[PDB]
Structure 1
Amino acid sequence: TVFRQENVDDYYDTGEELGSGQFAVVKKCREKSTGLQYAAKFIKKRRTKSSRRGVSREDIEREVSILKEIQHPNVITLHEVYENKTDVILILELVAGGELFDFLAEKSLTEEEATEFLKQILNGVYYLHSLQIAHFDLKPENIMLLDRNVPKPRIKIIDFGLAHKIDFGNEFKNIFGTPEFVAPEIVNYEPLGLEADMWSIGVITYILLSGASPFLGDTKQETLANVSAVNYEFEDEYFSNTSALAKDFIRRLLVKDPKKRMTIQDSLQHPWIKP
């Protein structure tokens, strides 16, 4: 599939930088014809068949195809796609309130503040999983706030760079995110499905409530070993006034066997969440 090959600068003016990954940079931008503001994500293309630099066309097209499907208040949306020899440029919805990761860093929360974030994340993932989309990179860095200066900020899930359609219940590709957040099946290179996201939500919930990361070791290999062994516990210093029901929610997500793990539907009916 090909994209718009006109110069993006003929249609948009870029401004401040919003984010910066390994093969991508995101710039605030403004569309000349409407005055409307967006986030332009510049993804570096692979320059040869066998290079390790840049993103393969297959991978870029997958991200774009998935993004084109989605329209939900808790997920980023795609406006337009441009490309040139060097980059594919995704014109995405602007989410200007910063990462949940940075919001947490200024602030740990009350259980109400945590469930207020978590419920929006669950709604977004419910939508994605209903479309058989596994995100595969859920972590606080990939949750963006619309406005961080309100008591209950609204959020959107971003960064669909590892997202896959799961049409046979599982996929068996080269897929591996950030050690602190990946499920044991990722660590062990096993077939992956929607369940991996639910583990990640468990990790996010643990961090939301405590300010601490449940499997984090001193090196990435230690973290991965900890994940595979389900080596986490609820430290009393962090969880002493956290409800047992909150712990129950986490405990039912941080389960090694993906079949025994709560699904997104389970998570919305769980007594800590269910209205």
Structure 2
Amino acid sequence: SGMENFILYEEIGRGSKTVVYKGRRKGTINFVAILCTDKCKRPEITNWVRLTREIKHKNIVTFHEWYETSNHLWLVVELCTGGSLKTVIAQDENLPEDVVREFGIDLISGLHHLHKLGILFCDISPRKILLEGPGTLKFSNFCLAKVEGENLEEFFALVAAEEASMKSRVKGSPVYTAPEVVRGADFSISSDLWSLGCLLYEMFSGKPPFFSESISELTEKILCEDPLPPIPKDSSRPKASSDFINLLDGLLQRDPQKRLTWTRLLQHSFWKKAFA
């Protein structure tokens, strides 16, 4: 029963109060990723499970099981041996536009599936995207995701109560936060599409469109700065196509009423009719 049913192999990743192992279900050849964490993370794990447990999609990490032992919580999910998108970007320094398009089609498929269900990812970022290998990107961390309109602090507090402080724990990365959210609005489908624009920009250029180590500077850049066009760190490499620049200009509109819609996003020339 429970974790008795799994072989644990090497550690493949770590986080705060967290270790991820490669594992295998005993009596099978089914390999899994097993996240082992402190019980204080029950709100984050419960949220991840409740949002994804019934999702079966190629571009979203599959849920299998979660279990509790005397001193740990355990989450058993799909194994992705290709690492994070953050590592891919750091290695190549910059990705060719054809690769960005291929990866982008994966990101679109997964995000479209979530938004259809009313699920906001809220912290779209390279470290929360895993690769199957060679490609096949998957959204892979739902601690901070939520259903549209939900108060996630309230949800975290309710989980913690059964067993204001939560306003901090629900904070993801500020780098990809849409301007309207910086200004106090709640996350939305449109703010996720902004973050997608930041991610596509970073995949091609190797760096996010708006970045500062300082928080106050980053806030001002998101609200004032115009980032186009993305230029690879390797200045000798090909420049962005006019279709790709046009796509980013639509996604990185600061005014969400002017931002590219899903319907226009899927029809955009950059995808070369991938969604026709």
TM-score range, shorter chain: 0.7 to 0.9
Indicate the SS of the match to 2:251: coil
1:260 to 258, 261, 265: 258
1:145 aligns to 2:131 (yes or no) = yes
1:40 aligns to 2:29 (yes or no) = no
Q: Indicate if the aligned counterparts of 2:14 and 2:20 stay in contact, CA closer than 8 A.
A: yes
Indicate the SS of the match to 1:69: coil
- Between the two proteins, what is the percent identity of the paired residues? 30
Match of 1:163 in 2: 145
1:198, distance to aligned residue in structure 2 (A): 0.7
d(CA) in 2 for partners of 1:44 and 1:229?
40
Indicate the SS of the match to 2:61: coil
Equivalent position amino acid for 1:245 in 2:
D
| Superposed counterparts of 1:46-195, under 5 Å | 46=40, 55=41, 57-107=42-92, 108-148=94-134, 153-166=135-148, 168=149, 174=167, 175-195=170-190
d(CA) in 1 for partners of 2:124 and 2:85?
11
Gaps of 5+ in 1: 1-5, 47-54
1:233, distance to aligned residue in structure 2 (A): 3.6
Indicate the SS of the match to 2:46: helix
Equivalent position amino acid for 1:66 in 2:
L
Moved more, 80-89 or 26-35: 80-89
d(CA) in 2 for partners of 1:137 and 1:13?
32
TM-score, normalisation: structure 1: 0.84
Match of 1:50 in 2: none
- Would the alpha carbon gap of residues 189 and 59 (structure 1) be closer, same or farther in structure 2, given more than 3 Å must change? farther
Moved more, 66-75 or 264-273: 264-273
d(CA) in 1 for partners of 2:108 and 2:69?
36
* Richer in helix (by share): 2
Q: Indicate if the aligned counterparts of 1:171 and 1:193 stay in contact, CA closer than 8 A.
A: no
d(CA) in 2 for partners of 1:112 and 1:180?
25
1:29 to 23, 26, 45: 23
TM-score, normalisation: structure 2: 0.83
1:33, distance to aligned residue in structure 2 (A): 2.4
Q: Indicate if the aligned counterparts of 2:231 and 2:240 stay in contact, CA closer than 8 A.
A: no
Indicate the SS of the match to 1:63: helix
Match of 1:227 in 2: 222
Indicate the SS of the match to 1:209: helix
1:220, distance to aligned residue in structure 2 (A): 3.2
Structure 1 vs Structure 2 CA RMSD:
2.3
